[PDB]
Design a binder for this molecule. Structure first.
Ligand SMILES: [K+]
Ligand SMILES: [Mg+2]
Ligand SMILES: [Mg+2]
Ligand SMILES: [Mg+2]
Length: 155
RNA sequence: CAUGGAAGUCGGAAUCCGCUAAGGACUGUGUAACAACUCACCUGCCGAAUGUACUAGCCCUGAAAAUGGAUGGCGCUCAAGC
């Protein structure tokens, strides 16, 4: 009746995976699972979505482990950026993440599907649209103006 | 975005909606980071006022000299003062 030892852990604060070893002795000690397996699993999961931690969730399954992604709107907005983030430059201005605000971001918002009520996606789409206030949407248009000016369709 | 580590509170730069009557992509304590405690903010109780800045009357502070001492003296307090 081990029940696979359901344990949930979070891995973030990084860029483009990295395959870092250990760094989670507390996670490893719980469930008698090898930390290297979880680190390798998390690195593989984050390899697909580079330059964005996306808050990977690690689930302990007996001696094995499982990887899960959050599909966060902010993580997707981080992915929708200007090209890739080169190394040896993250200490400098990392503002080079400006992309167009269009239906691609609108569809990417549908992953949440209004988890916190939001009265369906009517307020969820506008809220996820306004989430990209750092890049100010595309050109002179702004996420604040896009969300405030209610003229587009609901979906 | 920074990252052995920063989950609001090393550090650089903006400020969204669902939920309500109601909570910040945060004031402060705090963790390596969480957390907790908050706090802002809202709500139970209560039953009539409350806050800030100014104006000018009396009184008080500012107000230290040489023999013992002078509202003329005694004394006077809802005055025997203004
Ligand atoms: K007289
Ligand atoms: Mg005399
Ligand atoms: Mg007389
Ligand atoms: Mg008189």
């Amino acid at each position: 009746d081990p029940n696979e030892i359901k344990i949930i852990h979070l891995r973030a604060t990084g860029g483009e995976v990295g395959a870092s070893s250990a760094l989670a002795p507390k996670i490893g000690p719980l469930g008698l699972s090898p930390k290297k397996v979880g680190e390798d699993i998390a690195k593989a999961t984050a390899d697909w979505k580079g330059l964005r931690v996306t808050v990977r969730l690690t689930i302990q399954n007996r001696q094995a482990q499982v990887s899960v992604v959050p599909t966060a709107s902010a993580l997707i907005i981080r992915a929708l950026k200007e090209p890739p983030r080169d190394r040896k430059k993250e200490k400098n201005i990392k503002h080079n993440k400006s992309v167009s605000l269009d239906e691609i971001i609108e569809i990417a918002r549908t992953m949440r599907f209004k988890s916190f009520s939001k009265d369906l996606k009517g307020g969820v789409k506008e809220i996820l649209g306004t989430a990209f206030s750092v890049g100010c949407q595309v050109d002179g248009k702004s996420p604040k103006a896009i969300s405030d000016a209610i003229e587009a369709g609901e979906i």
